[PDB]
Protein backbone atom coordinates (compact mmCIF):
# COMPACT_ATOMS: atom_id res chain seq x y z
CA UNK A 1 0.00 0.00 0.00
CA UNK A 2 0.99 3.65 -0.45
CA UNK A 3 -0.09 6.96 1.07
CA UNK A 4 0.08 10.55 -0.19
CA UNK A 5 -0.23 13.14 2.56
CA UNK A 6 -0.85 16.84 2.09
CA UNK A 7 -1.05 20.18 3.89
CA UNK A 8 -4.26 22.12 3.22
CA UNK A 9 -5.93 25.22 4.65
CA UNK A 10 -9.48 24.37 5.79
CA UNK A 11 -11.41 21.23 6.68
CA UNK A 12 -13.66 21.74 3.64
CA UNK A 13 -10.55 21.52 1.47
CA UNK A 14 -9.63 18.34 3.34
CA UNK A 15 -13.04 16.84 2.55
CA UNK A 16 -12.63 17.86 -1.10
CA UNK A 17 -9.22 16.17 -1.13
CA UNK A 18 -10.75 13.01 0.35
CA UNK A 19 -13.46 13.00 -2.32
CA UNK A 20 -10.88 13.58 -5.06
CA UNK A 21 -8.64 10.75 -3.86
CA UNK A 22 -11.67 8.44 -3.60
CA UNK A 23 -12.63 9.30 -7.19
CA UNK A 24 -9.04 8.72 -8.34
CA UNK A 25 -9.01 5.33 -6.60
CA UNK A 26 -12.28 4.52 -8.37
CA UNK A 27 -10.47 5.24 -11.64
CA UNK A 28 -7.88 2.97 -13.29
CA UNK A 29 -7.44 -0.70 -12.40
CA UNK A 30 -6.35 -0.11 -8.78
CA UNK A 31 -4.61 -3.50 -8.81
CA UNK A 32 -2.24 -3.88 -5.82
CA UNK A 33 -2.06 -0.07 -5.57
CA UNK A 34 -4.15 1.71 -2.92
CA UNK A 35 -3.53 5.35 -1.98
CA UNK A 36 -5.19 6.57 1.22
CA UNK A 37 -4.42 10.21 1.98
CA UNK A 38 -3.86 12.19 5.18
CA UNK A 39 -4.08 15.91 5.88
CA UNK A 40 -2.89 18.49 8.40
CA UNK A 41 -3.67 22.15 9.05
CA UNK A 42 -1.42 25.20 9.35
CA UNK A 43 0.12 26.77 12.45
CA UNK A 44 1.17 30.34 13.31
CA UNK A 45 4.65 29.43 14.54
CA UNK A 46 6.84 28.15 11.71
CA UNK A 47 8.97 26.03 14.08
CA UNK A 48 5.87 24.22 15.34
CA UNK A 49 4.66 23.75 11.76
CA UNK A 50 7.96 22.19 10.64
CA UNK A 51 8.24 19.91 13.66
CA UNK A 52 4.62 18.78 13.36
CA UNK A 53 4.80 18.17 9.62
CA UNK A 54 7.96 16.07 9.89
CA UNK A 55 6.75 14.03 12.87
CA UNK A 56 3.37 13.44 11.20
CA UNK A 57 4.01 12.92 7.49
CA UNK A 58 7.53 11.48 7.72
CA UNK A 59 6.42 8.87 10.27
CA UNK A 60 3.70 7.72 7.84
CA UNK A 61 6.17 6.94 5.00
CA UNK A 62 4.56 9.18 2.39
CA UNK A 63 5.45 9.22 -1.31
CA UNK A 64 4.42 12.81 -2.11
CA UNK A 65 3.46 16.03 -0.32
CA UNK A 66 1.04 18.80 -1.33
CA UNK A 67 1.36 22.31 0.10
CA UNK A 68 -1.02 25.24 -0.39
CA UNK A 69 -0.97 28.87 0.66
CA UNK A 70 -3.01 29.49 3.85
CA UNK A 71 -6.02 31.84 3.75
CA UNK A 72 -4.11 34.56 5.61
CA UNK A 73 -3.64 37.69 3.46
CA UNK A 74 -0.30 38.54 1.83
CA UNK A 75 3.08 37.06 2.86
CA UNK A 76 4.81 33.99 1.40
CA UNK A 77 5.73 31.77 4.37
CA UNK A 78 3.56 28.93 3.05
CA UNK A 79 6.07 26.47 1.52
CA UNK A 80 9.37 27.45 3.12
CA UNK A 81 9.26 25.36 6.35
CA UNK A 82 7.71 22.33 4.65
CA UNK A 83 10.08 22.65 1.69
CA UNK A 84 13.12 22.92 3.96
CA UNK A 85 12.09 20.00 6.20
CA UNK A 86 11.07 17.71 3.33
CA UNK A 87 14.08 18.96 1.35
CA UNK A 88 16.39 16.99 3.64
CA UNK A 89 15.23 13.88 1.78
CA UNK A 90 14.14 13.81 -1.88
CA UNK A 91 10.37 13.41 -1.43
CA UNK A 92 8.82 15.81 -3.96
CA UNK A 93 6.48 18.58 -2.81
CA UNK A 94 3.77 19.88 -5.14
CA UNK A 95 2.79 23.54 -4.98
CA UNK A 96 -0.81 24.64 -5.42
CA UNK A 97 -1.17 28.44 -5.17
CA UNK A 98 2.38 29.64 -4.49
CA UNK A 99 3.66 31.95 -7.25
CA UNK A 100 7.04 33.36 -6.21
CA UNK A 101 10.38 33.58 -7.96
CA UNK A 102 12.43 32.53 -4.92
CA UNK A 103 11.31 28.91 -5.44
CA UNK A 104 12.91 28.65 -8.89
CA UNK A 105 16.58 28.39 -7.86
CA UNK A 106 17.10 24.62 -7.76
CA UNK A 107 20.29 25.16 -5.74
CA UNK A 108 18.29 26.52 -2.80
CA UNK A 109 15.19 24.31 -3.04
CA UNK A 110 16.44 21.05 -4.56
CA UNK A 111 13.03 19.31 -4.43
CA UNK A 112 10.01 21.48 -5.25
CA UNK A 113 7.35 21.22 -7.96
CA UNK A 114 4.20 23.23 -8.61
CA UNK A 115 1.55 23.92 -11.25
CA UNK A 116 1.26 27.74 -11.29
CA UNK A 117 3.07 30.13 -13.66
CA UNK A 118 5.79 32.13 -11.89
CA UNK A 119 6.34 35.86 -12.41
CA UNK A 120 8.72 35.28 -15.34
CA UNK A 121 5.83 34.32 -17.62
CA UNK A 122 4.62 37.88 -17.09
CA UNK A 123 7.77 39.09 -18.86
CA UNK A 124 7.35 36.41 -21.53
CA UNK A 125 3.77 37.48 -22.26
CA UNK A 126 4.87 41.13 -22.22
CA UNK A 127 7.31 40.29 -25.02
CA UNK A 128 4.63 38.30 -26.85
CA UNK A 129 2.14 41.18 -26.66
CA UNK A 130 4.77 43.76 -27.64
CA UNK A 131 5.71 41.72 -30.72
CA UNK A 132 2.23 42.35 -32.19
CA UNK A 133 2.04 46.13 -31.64
CA UNK A 134 5.58 46.94 -32.87
CA UNK A 135 6.80 49.66 -30.53
CA UNK A 136 10.10 48.15 -29.29
CA UNK A 137 11.17 51.02 -27.02
CA UNK A 138 10.64 49.41 -23.62
CA UNK A 139 11.84 51.24 -20.51
CA UNK A 140 11.11 49.39 -17.29
CA UNK A 141 11.28 49.98 -13.54
CA UNK A 142 12.45 47.10 -11.34
CA UNK A 143 12.30 46.76 -7.56
CA UNK A 144 15.67 45.93 -6.01
CA UNK A 145 14.89 42.53 -4.51
CA UNK A 146 14.95 38.95 -5.73
CA UNK A 147 11.45 39.35 -7.20
CA UNK A 148 12.28 42.12 -9.67
CA UNK A 149 15.78 40.90 -10.50
CA UNK A 150 14.38 37.68 -11.98
CA UNK A 151 12.01 39.68 -14.19
CA UNK A 152 14.88 41.91 -15.31
CA UNK A 153 17.03 38.91 -16.25
CA UNK A 154 14.13 37.24 -18.05
CA UNK A 155 13.40 40.35 -20.10
CA UNK A 156 17.09 40.94 -20.85
CA UNK A 157 17.80 37.56 -22.44
CA UNK A 158 14.55 37.35 -24.44
CA UNK A 159 15.25 40.59 -26.32
CA UNK A 160 18.82 39.50 -27.13
CA UNK A 161 17.45 36.68 -29.31
CA UNK A 162 15.69 39.35 -31.40
CA UNK A 163 18.80 41.61 -31.35
CA UNK A 164 17.14 44.56 -29.64
CA UNK A 165 17.87 46.94 -26.77
CA UNK A 166 15.33 48.25 -24.25
CA UNK A 167 16.08 51.94 -23.57
CA UNK A 168 17.28 52.29 -19.96
CA UNK A 169 16.63 50.41 -16.73
CA UNK A 170 16.13 52.10 -13.36
CA UNK A 171 16.28 50.93 -9.74
CA UNK A 172 14.18 52.71 -7.12
CA UNK A 173 14.89 50.56 -4.00
CA UNK A 174 12.24 48.89 -1.79
CA UNK A 175 10.68 50.20 1.39
CA UNK A 176 10.87 53.89 0.47
CA UNK A 177 8.26 56.65 0.46
CA UNK A 178 9.97 59.30 -1.71
CA UNK A 179 11.07 58.73 -5.31
CA UNK A 180 11.58 61.74 -7.59
CA UNK A 181 14.93 61.37 -9.41
CA UNK A 182 13.96 58.24 -11.35
CA UNK A 183 10.75 59.74 -12.75
CA UNK A 184 12.52 63.01 -13.59
CA UNK A 185 15.25 61.11 -15.46
CA UNK A 186 12.65 59.01 -17.29
CA UNK A 187 10.74 62.17 -18.25
CA UNK A 188 13.22 63.10 -21.01
CA UNK A 189 13.47 60.16 -23.42
CA UNK A 190 11.95 58.73 -26.61
CA UNK A 191 10.07 55.82 -25.01
CA UNK A 192 6.34 56.13 -24.25
CA UNK A 193 6.01 52.96 -22.15
CA UNK A 194 6.18 52.73 -18.36
CA UNK A 195 6.46 48.94 -17.92
CA UNK A 196 6.53 48.37 -14.16
CA UNK A 197 6.93 45.40 -11.81
CA UNK A 198 6.34 46.76 -8.30
CA UNK A 199 5.34 44.97 -5.08
CA UNK A 200 1.95 46.04 -3.69
CA UNK A 201 2.61 49.13 -1.57
CA UNK A 202 5.34 50.62 -3.78
CA UNK A 203 2.79 50.87 -6.60
CA UNK A 204 0.90 53.51 -4.61
CA UNK A 205 3.91 55.79 -4.13
CA UNK A 206 5.14 55.37 -7.70
CA UNK A 207 1.64 56.14 -9.02
CA UNK A 208 1.41 59.26 -6.84
CA UNK A 209 4.83 60.41 -8.06
CA UNK A 210 3.82 59.81 -11.68
CA UNK A 211 0.54 61.68 -11.21
CA UNK A 212 2.34 64.67 -9.68
CA UNK A 213 4.58 64.78 -12.78
CA UNK A 214 1.61 65.03 -15.23
CA UNK A 215 2.76 62.14 -17.40
CA UNK A 216 -0.51 60.15 -17.54
CA UNK A 217 -2.56 61.47 -20.44
CA UNK A 218 -2.26 61.80 -24.23
CA UNK A 219 0.40 59.13 -24.55
CA UNK A 220 2.73 57.37 -22.12
CA UNK A 221 0.99 54.00 -22.00
CA UNK A 222 1.45 51.77 -18.96
CA UNK A 223 2.05 48.05 -18.50
CA UNK A 224 1.97 46.37 -15.08
CA UNK A 225 1.99 42.95 -13.44
CA UNK A 226 -0.71 40.94 -11.72
CA UNK A 227 0.20 42.14 -8.22
CA UNK A 228 0.39 45.84 -9.17
CA UNK A 229 -3.37 46.38 -9.64
CA UNK A 230 -4.62 44.43 -6.61
CA UNK A 231 -5.95 45.83 -3.36
CA UNK A 232 -4.70 49.19 -2.12
CA UNK A 233 -2.62 49.70 -5.27
CA UNK A 234 -5.88 49.86 -7.25
CA UNK A 235 -7.27 52.86 -5.34
CA UNK A 236 -4.58 55.32 -6.48
CA UNK A 237 -4.12 54.49 -10.16
CA UNK A 238 -4.79 56.09 -13.56
CA UNK A 239 -7.01 54.53 -16.20
CA UNK A 240 -5.68 52.77 -19.29
CA UNK A 241 -3.25 50.46 -17.49
CA UNK A 242 -3.13 46.99 -19.07
CA UNK A 243 -3.51 45.25 -15.73
CA UNK A 244 -2.86 41.71 -16.92
CA UNK A 245 -4.05 38.95 -14.58
CA UNK A 246 -4.27 35.15 -14.55
CA UNK A 247 -7.24 32.86 -15.20
CA UNK A 248 -8.42 30.43 -12.50
CA UNK A 249 -6.10 32.14 -10.03
CA UNK A 250 -7.88 31.73 -6.69
CA UNK A 251 -9.10 28.24 -7.58
CA UNK A 252 -7.66 25.13 -5.93
CA UNK A 253 -10.17 22.27 -6.21
CA UNK A 254 -9.48 21.97 -9.94
CA UNK A 255 -5.76 22.30 -9.22
CA UNK A 256 -6.10 19.68 -6.48
CA UNK A 257 -7.74 17.28 -8.94
CA UNK A 258 -5.04 17.92 -11.55
CA UNK A 259 -2.28 17.39 -8.97
CA UNK A 260 -3.74 14.13 -7.66
CA UNK A 261 -4.26 12.87 -11.21
CA UNK A 262 -0.69 13.61 -12.26
CA UNK A 263 0.63 12.15 -8.99
CA UNK A 264 -1.34 8.94 -9.57
CA UNK A 265 -0.04 8.73 -13.14
CA UNK A 266 3.54 9.22 -11.95
CA UNK A 267 3.13 6.59 -9.21
CA UNK A 268 1.71 4.07 -11.68
CA UNK A 269 4.55 4.78 -14.11
CA UNK A 270 7.18 4.40 -11.37
CA UNK A 271 5.71 1.17 -9.97
CA UNK A 272 6.83 -0.74 -13.10
CA UNK A 273 10.55 -0.53 -12.36
CA UNK A 274 13.31 -2.27 -10.39
CA UNK A 275 13.43 -2.68 -6.61
CA UNK A 276 11.98 0.35 -4.81
CA UNK A 277 12.53 1.33 -1.18
CA UNK A 278 10.40 3.47 1.14
CA UNK A 279 11.20 6.87 2.65
CA UNK A 280 12.32 6.63 6.27
CA UNK A 281 10.02 7.32 9.21
CA UNK A 282 10.80 9.00 12.52
CA UNK A 283 12.31 12.43 11.77
CA UNK A 284 15.01 11.46 14.29
CA UNK A 285 16.80 8.18 13.60
CA UNK A 286 17.47 8.48 9.86
CA UNK A 287 20.02 10.78 8.20
CA UNK A 288 20.18 9.22 4.71
CA UNK A 289 17.96 9.71 1.67
CA UNK A 290 16.68 6.71 -0.23
CA UNK A 291 18.46 5.66 -3.40
CA UNK A 292 15.84 6.48 -6.05
CA UNK A 293 15.03 9.92 -4.68
CA UNK A 294 15.66 12.14 -7.71
CA UNK A 295 14.38 9.37 -9.99
CA UNK A 296 10.79 10.03 -8.89
CA UNK A 297 11.25 13.75 -9.55
CA UNK A 298 12.75 13.04 -12.99
CA UNK A 299 9.90 10.74 -14.01
CA UNK A 300 7.47 13.34 -12.63
CA UNK A 301 8.89 16.00 -14.96
CA UNK A 302 8.16 13.77 -17.98
CA UNK A 303 4.56 13.09 -16.88
CA UNK A 304 1.94 14.65 -19.17
CA UNK A 305 -1.79 14.37 -18.44
CA UNK A 306 -3.97 16.81 -20.40
CA UNK A 307 -7.35 15.55 -19.22
CA UNK A 308 -7.90 16.68 -15.63
CA UNK A 309 -9.58 20.09 -15.65
CA UNK A 310 -7.53 22.15 -18.10
CA UNK A 311 -5.06 21.95 -20.96
CA UNK A 312 -1.64 20.31 -21.21
CA UNK A 313 -0.16 20.28 -17.70
CA UNK A 314 3.43 19.98 -18.94
CA UNK A 315 6.47 20.44 -16.70
CA UNK A 316 9.53 22.02 -18.32
CA UNK A 317 13.14 21.70 -17.16
CA UNK A 318 12.66 24.33 -14.45
CA UNK A 319 9.51 22.58 -13.23
CA UNK A 320 7.13 25.53 -12.93
CA UNK A 321 4.66 24.88 -15.79
CA UNK A 322 4.21 25.10 -19.55
CA UNK A 323 1.41 26.33 -21.82
CA UNK A 324 -0.45 28.53 -19.36
CA UNK A 325 -3.44 30.80 -20.02
CA UNK A 326 -3.87 34.49 -19.20
CA UNK A 327 -6.61 37.10 -19.58
CA UNK A 328 -5.45 40.61 -20.49
CA UNK A 329 -7.61 43.03 -18.51
CA UNK A 330 -7.66 46.81 -18.94
CA UNK A 331 -8.81 49.38 -16.40
CA UNK A 332 -11.50 51.62 -17.88
CA UNK A 333 -13.10 54.08 -15.44
CA UNK A 334 -12.93 51.35 -12.78
CA UNK A 335 -14.72 47.99 -13.18
CA UNK A 336 -12.01 46.16 -15.14
CA UNK A 337 -13.29 44.72 -18.42
CA UNK A 338 -11.80 41.75 -20.26
CA UNK A 339 -10.06 42.82 -23.47
CA UNK A 340 -8.12 39.80 -24.69
CA UNK A 341 -6.99 36.21 -24.26
CA UNK A 342 -3.49 34.74 -24.35
CA UNK A 343 -2.55 31.09 -24.89
CA UNK A 344 1.08 31.14 -26.06
CA UNK A 345 2.43 33.09 -29.05
CA UNK A 346 -1.21 33.38 -30.19
CA UNK A 347 -2.47 36.55 -28.50
CA UNK A 348 -6.06 37.02 -29.67
CA UNK A 349 -7.53 40.45 -28.91
CA UNK A 350 -11.28 40.58 -28.36
CA UNK A 351 -13.64 43.05 -30.06
CA UNK A 352 -15.01 45.00 -27.11
CA UNK A 353 -13.01 48.27 -27.30
CA UNK A 354 -9.70 49.88 -26.38
CA UNK A 355 -9.28 53.07 -24.32
CA UNK A 356 -5.70 54.28 -24.05
CA UNK A 357 -4.80 56.44 -21.03
CA UNK A 358 -5.68 59.69 -22.76
CA UNK A 359 -9.29 59.14 -23.72
CA UNK A 360 -8.27 58.64 -27.36
CA UNK A 361 -8.87 55.61 -29.60
CA UNK A 362 -5.83 55.23 -31.87
CA UNK A 363 -2.81 53.30 -30.64
CA UNK A 364 -0.21 55.84 -29.43
CA UNK A 365 3.12 55.40 -31.19
CA UNK A 366 6.00 55.45 -28.73
CA UNK A 367 8.53 57.85 -30.26
CA UNK A 368 9.21 61.60 -30.19
CA UNK A 369 12.97 61.98 -30.94
CA UNK A 370 12.86 65.47 -29.34
CA UNK A 371 14.10 67.16 -32.59
CA UNK A 372 17.15 68.44 -30.72
CA UNK A 373 20.82 67.47 -30.51
CA UNK A 374 23.77 68.18 -28.21
CA UNK A 375 26.74 68.19 -30.60
CA UNK A 376 30.16 68.14 -28.93
CA UNK A 377 33.35 69.16 -30.75
CA UNK A 378 37.06 69.26 -29.90
CA UNK A 379 39.22 72.25 -30.80
CA UNK A 380 41.47 71.70 -33.82
CA UNK A 381 43.59 74.04 -35.93
CA UNK A 382 42.15 73.78 -39.48
CA UNK A 383 38.75 72.19 -38.72
CA UNK A 384 37.11 73.90 -35.71
Amino acid sequence: IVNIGAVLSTRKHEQMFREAVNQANKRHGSWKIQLNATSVTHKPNAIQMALSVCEDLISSQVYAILVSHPPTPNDHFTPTPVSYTAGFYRIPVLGLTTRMSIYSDKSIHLSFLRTVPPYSHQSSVWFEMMRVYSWNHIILLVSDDHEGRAAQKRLETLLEERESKAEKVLQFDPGTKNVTALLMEAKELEARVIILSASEDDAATVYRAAAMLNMTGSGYVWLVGEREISGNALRYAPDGILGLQLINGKNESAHISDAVGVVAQAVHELLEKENITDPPRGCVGNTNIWKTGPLFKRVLMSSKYADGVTGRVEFNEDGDRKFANYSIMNLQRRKLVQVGIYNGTHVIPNDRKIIWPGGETEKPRGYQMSTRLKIVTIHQEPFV
Partner: antibody, heavy 117, light 109 residues
Framework: LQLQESGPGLVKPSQTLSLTCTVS?????????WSWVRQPPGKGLEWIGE???????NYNPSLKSRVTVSVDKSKNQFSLKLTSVTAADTAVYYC?????????????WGQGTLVTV | NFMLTQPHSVSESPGKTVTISCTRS????????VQWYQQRPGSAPTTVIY?????PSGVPDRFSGSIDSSSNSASLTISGLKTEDEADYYC?????????FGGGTKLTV
Protein backbone atom coordinates in the same frame (compact mmCIF):
# COMPACT_ATOMS: atom_id res chain seq x y z
CA LEU B 1 -24.00 72.82 -18.28
CA GLN B 2 -27.65 71.81 -17.94
CA LEU B 3 -29.53 68.56 -18.53
CA GLN B 4 -33.17 68.02 -19.47
CA GLU B 5 -34.61 64.50 -19.59
CA SER B 6 -37.78 63.86 -21.60
CA GLY B 7 -39.49 60.49 -21.79
CA PRO B 8 -42.03 59.01 -24.21
CA GLY B 9 -44.78 59.41 -21.60
CA LEU B 10 -45.93 55.79 -22.00
CA VAL B 11 -46.03 53.91 -18.69
CA LYS B 12 -48.19 50.97 -19.75
CA PRO B 13 -47.34 47.62 -18.12
CA SER B 14 -45.12 45.20 -20.04
CA GLN B 15 -43.49 47.76 -22.34
CA THR B 16 -40.13 49.39 -23.05
CA LEU B 17 -39.14 52.87 -21.85
CA SER B 18 -36.87 55.02 -24.02
CA LEU B 19 -36.14 58.57 -22.84
CA THR B 20 -33.61 61.16 -24.01
CA CYS B 21 -31.57 63.50 -21.79
CA THR B 22 -30.56 66.55 -23.82
CA VAL B 23 -27.53 68.55 -22.68
CA SER B 24 -27.28 72.33 -23.09
CA UNK B 25 -23.87 73.96 -22.79
CA UNK B 26 -22.02 70.65 -23.04
CA UNK B 27 -20.61 68.44 -25.77
CA UNK B 28 -21.69 64.81 -26.14
CA UNK B 29 -18.29 63.91 -27.61
CA UNK B 30 -15.68 64.40 -24.88
CA UNK B 31 -13.38 62.49 -22.52
CA UNK B 32 -16.06 62.27 -19.82
CA UNK B 33 -18.72 59.61 -19.16
CA TRP B 34 -22.52 59.68 -18.99
CA SER B 35 -24.55 57.38 -16.73
CA TRP B 36 -28.18 56.72 -15.82
CA VAL B 37 -29.49 56.65 -12.24
CA ARG B 38 -32.68 54.90 -11.10
CA GLN B 39 -34.62 55.67 -7.93
CA PRO B 40 -37.61 53.59 -6.78
CA PRO B 41 -40.28 55.52 -4.85
CA GLY B 42 -39.74 55.53 -1.10
CA LYS B 43 -36.52 53.51 -1.25
CA GLY B 44 -32.81 53.86 -1.96
CA LEU B 45 -30.97 54.53 -5.21
CA GLU B 46 -29.20 52.30 -7.72
CA TRP B 47 -27.06 52.67 -10.84
CA ILE B 48 -28.16 51.02 -14.08
CA GLY B 49 -25.34 51.82 -16.52
CA GLU B 50 -22.94 54.30 -18.04
CA UNK B 51 -22.47 55.41 -21.65
CA UNK B 52 -19.43 56.44 -23.66
CA UNK B 53 -19.32 57.89 -27.17
CA UNK B 54 -16.07 56.03 -27.92
CA UNK B 55 -17.46 52.50 -27.69
CA UNK B 56 -17.84 49.98 -24.89
CA UNK B 57 -20.26 50.40 -21.99
CA ASN B 58 -20.94 48.58 -18.71
CA TYR B 59 -24.59 48.46 -17.67
CA ASN B 60 -24.83 46.01 -14.73
CA PRO B 61 -24.32 42.32 -13.89
CA SER B 62 -27.85 41.98 -12.48
CA LEU B 63 -29.60 42.93 -15.76
CA LYS B 64 -26.79 42.38 -18.26
CA SER B 65 -29.16 40.74 -20.78
CA ARG B 66 -32.13 43.13 -20.56
CA VAL B 67 -30.74 46.70 -20.79
CA THR B 68 -29.17 48.36 -23.83
CA VAL B 69 -28.21 52.05 -23.97
CA SER B 70 -27.14 53.86 -27.14
CA VAL B 71 -25.78 57.30 -28.02
CA ASP B 72 -26.04 59.56 -31.08
CA LYS B 73 -23.40 62.27 -31.47
CA SER B 74 -25.33 63.91 -34.33
CA LYS B 75 -28.28 64.88 -32.11
CA ASN B 76 -26.26 65.16 -28.85
CA GLN B 77 -28.59 62.52 -27.40
CA PHE B 78 -28.24 59.23 -25.52
CA SER B 79 -31.14 56.83 -25.04
CA LEU B 80 -31.74 53.49 -23.33
CA LYS B 81 -33.82 50.49 -24.45
CA LEU B 82 -35.03 48.52 -21.42
CA THR B 83 -36.77 45.49 -22.92
CA SER B 84 -39.08 43.08 -21.07
CA VAL B 85 -39.58 45.63 -18.29
CA THR B 86 -41.95 44.36 -15.60
CA ALA B 87 -44.89 46.33 -14.22
CA ALA B 88 -43.00 46.75 -10.92
CA ASP B 89 -40.32 48.88 -12.63
CA THR B 90 -42.04 52.13 -11.61
CA ALA B 91 -39.25 54.51 -10.60
CA VAL B 92 -37.67 57.88 -11.44
CA TYR B 93 -34.82 58.19 -13.95
CA TYR B 94 -32.11 60.84 -13.57
CA CYS B 95 -29.21 61.67 -15.89
CA UNK B 96 -26.02 62.79 -14.13
CA UNK B 97 -22.97 62.19 -16.26
CA UNK B 98 -19.64 62.10 -14.32
CA UNK B 99 -16.58 64.04 -13.25
CA UNK B 100 -13.35 63.25 -15.09
CA UNK B 101 -11.01 63.54 -12.08
CA UNK B 102 -9.72 60.26 -10.71
CA UNK B 103 -12.90 58.82 -9.18
CA UNK B 104 -16.57 58.73 -10.15
CA UNK B 105 -18.77 61.45 -8.66
CA UNK B 106 -22.05 62.61 -10.19
CA UNK B 107 -22.06 66.38 -10.77
CA UNK B 108 -24.40 68.00 -11.57
CA TRP B 109 -27.68 66.05 -11.27
CA GLY B 110 -30.42 66.33 -13.86
CA GLN B 111 -34.00 67.20 -12.98
CA GLY B 112 -35.00 63.61 -13.74
CA THR B 113 -38.17 62.06 -15.12
CA LEU B 114 -41.26 60.51 -13.55
CA VAL B 115 -42.50 57.08 -14.67
CA THR B 116 -45.28 55.01 -13.06
CA VAL B 117 -45.61 51.59 -14.71
CA ASN C 1 -21.17 43.53 -4.66
CA PHE C 2 -22.31 44.61 -1.19
CA MET C 3 -24.79 46.86 0.62
CA LEU C 4 -24.65 50.07 2.65
CA THR C 5 -26.52 50.45 5.94
CA GLN C 6 -27.90 53.79 7.13
CA PRO C 7 -30.36 54.63 9.92
CA HIS C 8 -33.95 55.48 9.05
CA SER C 9 -34.05 58.92 10.69
CA VAL C 10 -32.36 61.13 13.28
CA SER C 11 -33.34 64.19 15.30
CA GLU C 12 -31.31 66.75 17.23
CA SER C 13 -31.46 70.29 18.56
CA PRO C 14 -30.59 73.12 16.15
CA GLY C 15 -27.12 74.61 16.39
CA LYS C 16 -25.56 71.35 17.61
CA THR C 17 -23.29 68.75 16.00
CA VAL C 18 -24.94 65.78 14.29
CA THR C 19 -22.86 62.79 13.17
CA ILE C 20 -24.17 60.31 10.58
CA SER C 21 -22.46 57.00 9.85
CA CYS C 22 -22.55 54.88 6.69
CA THR C 23 -21.32 51.31 7.14
CA ARG C 24 -20.04 48.88 4.49
CA SER C 25 -20.51 45.27 5.55
CA UNK C 26 -18.38 43.48 2.95
CA UNK C 27 -14.65 43.97 2.48
CA UNK C 28 -13.33 47.18 3.99
CA UNK C 29 -14.13 50.80 3.08
CA UNK C 30 -10.58 52.12 3.38
CA UNK C 31 -9.10 52.26 -0.15
CA UNK C 32 -11.86 53.34 -2.53
CA UNK C 33 -13.35 56.79 -2.09
CA VAL C 34 -16.89 57.62 -0.99
CA GLN C 35 -19.20 60.57 -1.61
CA TRP C 36 -22.02 62.20 0.36
CA TYR C 37 -25.04 63.47 -1.60
CA GLN C 38 -27.98 65.52 -0.33
CA GLN C 39 -31.44 65.45 -1.93
CA ARG C 40 -34.16 67.96 -1.11
CA PRO C 41 -37.80 66.78 -0.98
CA GLY C 42 -39.02 66.85 -4.58
CA SER C 43 -35.75 68.30 -5.91
CA ALA C 44 -32.72 66.82 -7.63
CA PRO C 45 -29.96 65.51 -5.33
CA THR C 46 -27.01 67.81 -4.67
CA THR C 47 -23.48 66.67 -3.85
CA VAL C 48 -22.26 67.87 -0.46
CA ILE C 49 -19.03 65.99 0.31
CA TYR C 50 -16.55 64.53 -2.18
CA UNK C 51 -13.16 62.93 -1.46
CA UNK C 52 -14.11 63.15 2.27
CA UNK C 53 -11.67 66.06 2.57
CA UNK C 54 -12.86 68.77 0.13
CA UNK C 55 -16.13 70.59 -0.47
CA PRO C 56 -17.77 71.93 -3.64
CA SER C 57 -17.62 75.62 -4.48
CA GLY C 58 -20.11 77.55 -2.37
CA VAL C 59 -20.78 74.61 -0.03
CA PRO C 60 -21.01 75.49 3.69
CA ASP C 61 -17.99 74.77 5.85
CA ARG C 62 -20.12 73.13 8.56
CA PHE C 63 -20.20 69.79 6.74
CA SER C 64 -17.15 67.60 7.32
CA GLY C 65 -16.16 64.05 6.47
CA SER C 66 -14.02 61.43 8.17
CA ILE C 67 -13.04 57.78 7.76
CA ASP C 68 -13.07 55.50 10.80
CA SER C 69 -10.75 52.90 9.20
CA SER C 70 -11.45 50.75 12.28
CA SER C 71 -15.20 50.00 12.31
CA ASN C 72 -15.32 50.16 8.48
CA SER C 73 -17.65 53.15 8.30
CA ALA C 74 -17.60 56.72 7.00
CA SER C 75 -18.76 59.60 9.21
CA LEU C 76 -20.29 62.91 8.12
CA THR C 77 -20.54 65.70 10.70
CA ILE C 78 -22.87 68.71 10.42
CA SER C 79 -22.51 71.68 12.76
CA GLY C 80 -24.97 74.50 13.38
CA LEU C 81 -28.19 72.74 12.42
CA LYS C 82 -30.72 74.87 10.53
CA THR C 83 -34.25 74.32 9.26
CA GLU C 84 -33.03 74.78 5.67
CA ASP C 85 -30.85 71.66 6.07
CA GLU C 86 -33.89 69.35 6.34
CA ALA C 87 -33.24 66.92 3.48
CA ASP C 88 -32.12 63.36 2.76
CA TYR C 89 -28.47 62.30 2.93
CA TYR C 90 -27.09 59.41 0.89
CA CYS C 91 -23.69 57.69 0.89
CA UNK C 92 -22.42 56.49 -2.49
CA UNK C 93 -19.41 54.26 -3.11
CA UNK C 94 -17.79 52.43 -6.01
CA UNK C 95 -16.15 49.02 -6.24
CA UNK C 96 -14.16 46.96 -8.74
CA UNK C 97 -17.41 45.62 -10.25
CA UNK C 98 -20.30 48.08 -9.72
CA UNK C 99 -21.30 51.09 -7.61
CA UNK C 100 -23.72 51.26 -4.69
CA PHE C 101 -25.76 53.86 -2.81
CA GLY C 102 -26.62 54.01 0.87
CA GLY C 103 -30.04 53.58 2.42
CA GLY C 104 -30.28 57.24 3.36
CA THR C 105 -31.37 59.16 6.44
CA LYS C 106 -33.62 62.15 7.12
CA LEU C 107 -33.13 64.59 9.99
CA THR C 108 -35.87 66.45 11.87
CA VAL C 109 -35.59 69.61 13.95
Amino acid sequence: LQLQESGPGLVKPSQTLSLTCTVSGGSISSSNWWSWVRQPPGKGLEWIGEIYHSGNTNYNPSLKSRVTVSVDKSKNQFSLKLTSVTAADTAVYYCARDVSGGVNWFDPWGQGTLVTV
Amino acid sequence: NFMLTQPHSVSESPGKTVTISCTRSSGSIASNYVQWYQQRPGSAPTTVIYEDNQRPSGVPDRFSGSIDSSSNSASLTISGLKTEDEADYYCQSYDSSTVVFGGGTKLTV
